[PDB]
Design an enzyme around this catalytic site. Structure first.
Site, short mmCIF file in Angstrom:
data_model
loop_
_atom_site.label_atom_id
_atom_site.label_comp_id
_atom_site.label_asym_id
_atom_site.label_seq_id
_atom_site.Cartn_x
_atom_site.Cartn_y
_atom_site.Cartn_z
N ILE A 157 0.88 -1.17 0.00
CA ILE A 157 0.00 0.00 0.00
C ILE A 157 0.90 1.20 0.00
O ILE A 157 1.80 1.29 0.83
CB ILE A 157 -0.96 -0.03 1.20
N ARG A 166 -1.21 -12.64 0.12
CA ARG A 166 0.07 -13.35 0.08
C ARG A 166 -0.03 -14.75 0.59
O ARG A 166 0.69 -15.65 0.09
CB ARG A 166 1.16 -12.61 0.86
N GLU A 176 -1.74 -8.95 3.11
CA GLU A 176 -1.11 -10.12 3.72
C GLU A 176 -1.95 -11.37 3.47
O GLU A 176 -1.40 -12.50 3.38
CB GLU A 176 -0.92 -9.99 5.24
C1 LIG Z 1 2.05 -4.90 2.51
C2 LIG Z 1 1.49 -3.51 2.46
O1 LIG Z 1 0.48 -3.39 1.75
N1 LIG Z 1 2.05 -2.47 3.12
C3 LIG Z 1 3.23 -2.50 4.02
C4 LIG Z 1 4.47 -1.93 3.32
O2 LIG Z 1 4.30 -0.52 3.07
C5 LIG Z 1 5.78 -2.28 4.07
O3 LIG Z 1 6.83 -2.17 3.13
C6 LIG Z 1 5.85 -3.66 4.75
C7 LIG Z 1 5.93 -3.69 6.29
O4 LIG Z 1 7.19 -3.66 6.95
O5 LIG Z 1 4.72 -4.44 4.40
C8 LIG Z 1 3.51 -3.82 4.80
O6 LIG Z 1 3.58 -3.54 6.18
#
Ligand SMILES: CC(=O)N[C@@H]1[C@@H](O)[C@H](O)[C@@H](CO)O[C@H]1O
Ligand SMILES: *[C@@H]1O[C@H](CO)[C@@H](O)[C@H](O)[C@H]1NC(C)=O
Length: 246
Positions: free
Chosen positions: A71, A163, A160
């Site tokens: 995001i 994923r 997540e």
């Molecule tokens: C996965 C998502 O959508 N956003 C964040 C991203 O900004 C960051 O790079 C990492 C956390 O350390 O992954 C998620 O927290």
């Protein structure tokens, strides 16, 4: 674009959203049968827009980087919000250009900074569909402290879960009741980049990781992942961060 309505949401419709989210991420190859996210994408094609509707039908649009499922920012009414990171700043060049103002949040997007800003680790932040409804609501009216906690929820309930199938299932179980994430859920989140790398390296190594990945299981026990036969690889993970981005 991919859309999700919390009004009438149930495990099934949320399952459908998460399937759509994954299907909107482009890839040209699979590695051990898992889509491999592209090394890069130029221009606005780099960013997917998710339309999220809270129960009362209010919406936000979230911009997601399709190479890494991060995001970068979101739009709420006529105001755009973007993390304080160069990746997001670059994204602001391509999405929500027609927002009446652009606010840069006083933190980057990574879990560690978000937890500081929120004043708590995601171990203690309940997640689920009700929490996602709440999160959407919170993001509509700028508070930066509240927004940090709301983004921890959004990230976990969207990215997540895309994923990892185990995380999508966690959220489905929390369709009508929030619950902080299991430790295994946290461990998966934290290992995504590592797992992605090791699965890729396994391709010229007979399916064997160069360095084993340490997770936690549903029972709280520390488990070693050494090869592609593991259920984490065979059943759980659904997208691979490209090693070019590790
Ligand atoms: C996965 C998502 O959508 N956003 C964040 C991203 O900004 C960051 O790079 C990492 C956390 O350390 O992954 C998620 O927290
Ligand atoms: C690979 O992983 C499976 C599951 O952990 C295990 O049973 C097996 O002994 C491992 N094999 C190798 C070659 O590392």
């Amino acid at each position: 674009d991919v859309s999700f309505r919390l009004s009438g949401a149930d495990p099934s419709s949320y399952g459908m959203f998460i399937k759509d989210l994954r299907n909107a991420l482009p890839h040209t190859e699979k590695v051990y049968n898992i889509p491999l996210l592209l090394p890069s994408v130029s221009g606005a094609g780099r960013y997917l827009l998710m339309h999220l509707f809270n129960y009362d039908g209010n919406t936000i649009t979230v911009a997601v980087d399709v190479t890494n499922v991060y995001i970068m920012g979101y739009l709420a009414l006529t105001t755009s919000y973007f993390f304080n990171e160069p990746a997001a700043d670059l994204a602001s060049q391509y999405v929500f250009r027609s927002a009446r103002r652009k606010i840069t949040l006083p933190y980057s997007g990574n879990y560690e900074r978000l937890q500081i800003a929120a004043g708590k680790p995601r171990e203690k932040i309940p997640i689920g569909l009700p929490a996602l409804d709440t999160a959407i609501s919170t993001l509509l009216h700028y508070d930066s402290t509240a927004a940090a906690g709301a983004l921890l929820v959004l990230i976990q309930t969207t990215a997540e879960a895309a994923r990892f199938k185990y995380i999508e299932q966690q959220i489905q179980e929390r369709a009508y009741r929030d619950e902080v994430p299991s430790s295994a859920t946290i461990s998966l989140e934290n290992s995504w980049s590592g797992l992605s790398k090791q699965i890729q390296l396994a391709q010229g190594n007979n399916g064997v990781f160069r360095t084993p990945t340490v997770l936690v299981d549903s029972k709280g026990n520390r488990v070693q992942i050494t090869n592609v036969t593991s259920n984490v690889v065979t059943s759980n993970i659904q997208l691979l961060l490209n090693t070019k981005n590790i």
